[PDB]
C-alpha cells in the first residue's frame, strides 16, 4: 500500500497556537479548503477542558472528507463553555454565537489563565449582553449602537436608559475557574455539492 506524499498540512497550529484570539461577539472565522487535515496535532496542545464532537466520531476524523472546514475562535468565561453546544440558551448562545440544532463538528475549549489574564485586569475581550432578538445560527453582529431600554428615544449618546450593549471580561489571575479565560475553537464540517477537498492522511 503506497500513497502520494503528505505535503500540504492544514494550518491548525495557527488557529490554536495564536498570539491573541478574537472577542466573542466578533468571533474569528477561518476557512480551510485545500489541505490534508491532521487532527492529531490538536491533541499536541494543552489538555482540553472540553472536547465535544457532534455528528462525527472523534476518532474517525481522518477517515472523512469534507468540502470546507470552518474554524471559529473566541475567548469566553469558564461558566459559558456549556453554552457552545447545539440547542442552548444563555448570554452567549443567544446574543453572541449560536450553533445550529443539527450541528456537525467539534468544540474544543481549554483554559488560558496564563495567557489571557493580567494581574491588573485584561480589559480587551468583549461580549454583548443586550440585544432585541436571538441570533440566527452562524450569524455575527458587530455593532456599537447604544441600546434602548426605556420608552424615550435614544439618539446615540449614552445616558439614562441608554447603555452600550458590550462589556468586558476583566480577566484576572485571582478569579475562580468559572471566570477564567477559556479559548474556544469550533470546527464545522461542510458537505456541499463541491468536491470534498479537505481529506486526511
Amino acid at each position: 500500500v503506497r500513497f502520494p506524499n503528505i505535503t500540504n498540512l492544514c494550518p491548525f497550529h495557527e488557529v490554536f497556537n495564536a498570539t491573541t484570539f478574537a472577542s466573542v461577539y466578533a468571533w474569528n472565522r477561518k476557512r480551510i479548503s485545500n489541505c490534508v487535515a491532521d487532527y492529531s496535532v490538536i491533541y499536541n496542545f494543552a489538555p482540553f477542558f472540553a472536547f465535544k464532537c457532534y455528528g462525527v466520531s472523534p476518532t474517525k476524523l481522518n477517515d472523512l472528507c469534507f468540502t470546507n472546514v470552518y474554524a471559529d475562535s473566541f475567548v469566553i468565561r469558564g461558566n459559558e463553555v456549556s453554552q457552545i453546544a447545539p440547542g442552548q440558551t444563555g448570554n452567549i448562545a443567544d446574543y453572541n454565537y449560536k450553533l445550529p440544532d443539527d450541528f456537525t463538528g467539534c468544540v474544543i475549549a481549554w483554559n488560558s489563565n496564563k495567557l489571557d489574564s493580567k494581574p491588573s485586569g485584561n480589559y480587551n475581550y468583549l461580549y454583548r449582553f443586550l440585544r432585541k432578538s436571538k441570533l440566527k445560527p452562524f450569524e455575527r453582529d458587530i455593532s456599537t449602537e447604544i441600546y434602548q431600554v426605556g420608552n424615550k428615544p435614544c439618539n446615540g449618546v449614552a445616558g439614562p436608559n441608554c447603555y452600550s450593549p458590550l462589556q468586558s471580561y476583566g480577566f484576572r489571575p485571582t478569579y475562580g475557574v468559572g471566570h477564567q479565560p477559556y479559548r474556544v475553537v469550533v470546527l464545522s464540517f461542510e458537505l456541499l455539492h463541491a468536491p470534498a477537498t479537505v481529506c486526511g492522511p
Epitope: 440558551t89 444563555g90 448570554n91 443567544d94 446574543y95 449582553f129 443586550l130 440585544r131 432585541k132 432578538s133 436571538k134 441600546y147 434602548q148 431600554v149 426605556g150 420608552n151 436608559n161 447603555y163 462589556q167 471580561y169 476583566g170 484576572r172 485571582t174 478569579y175 475562580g176 475557574v177 468559572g178 471566570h179
Partner: antibody
Framework: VQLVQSGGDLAPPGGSLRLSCEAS????????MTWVRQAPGKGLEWVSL???????FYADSVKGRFTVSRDNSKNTLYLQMSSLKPEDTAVYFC????????????WGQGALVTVSS | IQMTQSPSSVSASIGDTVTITCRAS??????VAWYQQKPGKAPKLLIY???NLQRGVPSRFSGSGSGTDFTLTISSLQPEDLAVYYC?????????FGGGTKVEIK
C-alpha cells in the same frame, strides 16, 4: 420607571395562579425581567428570569411548574404557577434587570401567594 | 458561586459607621450589587458594580471591594437605615442572594 403588580390570592395545594406586572417608562420587550420571591421571615430567593429575546430560566425547585411570559401589546410580564406547593407561599417581586450595569434597579410592589386549604 | 455575608447582629447608634462584609466562595469580578429592603417594601438598589452609587441614593452609602471580599459602608447611621441589606452577584444566571444583614439602632 414604574412596575405596577397585580394578582395574588389563596390557592389550593394544586391550584394555578397568574401574577402580572405592567411597566410604564420601560419596554418589557427590550429588558431582562426577573421574578424573585421572599418567603415569610426568610431571605430573597431567585425564581425566574426572562430575556429580551425570549429565553426563560428558572430555579431548580420551580422548573417544570412555573412559566414566565410577556405580553407586548399591554407591556405586561406574567408569572404563571401551574402546580403549587406549601413551599411556594411567598411575596413575589418583578424587577427590571440591568445585569452587570445595575442589576435589579426597578422593582414592583410584590404579590403575596399563600398555598393552603 | 456562594456568597456568604456577615450576620444580622449589627446594632449601632445614630451617626456610627456601619460595615457589612460579603465573601464569595471563589474570586468573582467586581459586579456585586447591594440592596436595601425595609419591612413590607420591595428591595431598593443602592450600589452596583461594587463601587458605583445609585442615583437618588445618599452619599453615605459607599461600596468597596475586589476578588473575594466586598464591603458596604454607611458613614452615618441615620434612623432611616433600619433595613435588611442584601448582596447579589449581578452576573449569575441562577440568582445568588446572600443572607441579609439586619441593621438596628441602639
Amino acid at each position: 420607571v414604574q412596575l405596577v403588580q397585580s394578582g395574588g390570592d389563596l390557592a389550593p395545594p394544586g391550584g394555578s395562579l397568574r401574577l402580572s406586572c405592567e411597566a410604564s417608562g420601560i419596554i418589557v420587550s427590550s429588558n431582562y425581567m426577573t421574578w424573585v420571591r421572599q418567603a415569610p421571615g426568610k431571605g430573597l430567593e431567585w425564581v425566574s428570569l426572562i430575556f429580551a429575546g425570549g429565553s426563560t430560566f428558572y430555579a431548580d425547585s420551580v422548573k417544570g411548574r412555573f412559566t414566565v411570559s410577556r405580553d407586548n401589546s399591554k407591556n405586561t410580564l406574567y408569572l404563571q404557577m401551574s402546580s403549587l406547593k406549601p413551599e411556594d407561599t411567598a411575596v413575589y417581586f418583578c424587577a427590571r434587570d440591568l445585569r452587570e450595569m445595575g442589576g435589579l434597579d426597578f422593582w414592583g410592589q410584590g404579590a403575596l401567594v399563600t398555598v393552603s386549604s | 458561586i456562594q456568597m456568604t455575608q456577615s450576620p444580622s447582629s449589627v446594632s449601632a447608634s445614630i451617626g456610627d459607621t456601619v460595615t457589612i462584609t460579603c465573601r464569595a466562595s471563589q474570586g468573582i469580578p467586581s459586579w456585586v450589587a447591594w440592596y436595601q429592603q425595609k419591612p413590607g417594601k420591595a428591595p431598593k438598589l443602592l450600589i452596583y458594580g461594587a463601587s458605583n452609587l445609585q442615583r437618588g441614593v445618599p452619599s453615605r452609602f459607599s461600596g468597596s471591594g475586589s476578588g473575594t471580599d466586598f464591603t458596604l459602608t454607611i458613614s452615618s447611621l441615620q434612623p432611616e437605615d433600619l433595613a435588611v441589606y442584601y448582596c447579589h452577584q449581578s452576573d449569575s444566571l441562577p440568582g445568588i442572594f446572600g443572607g441579609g444583614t439586619k441593621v438596628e439602632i441602639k
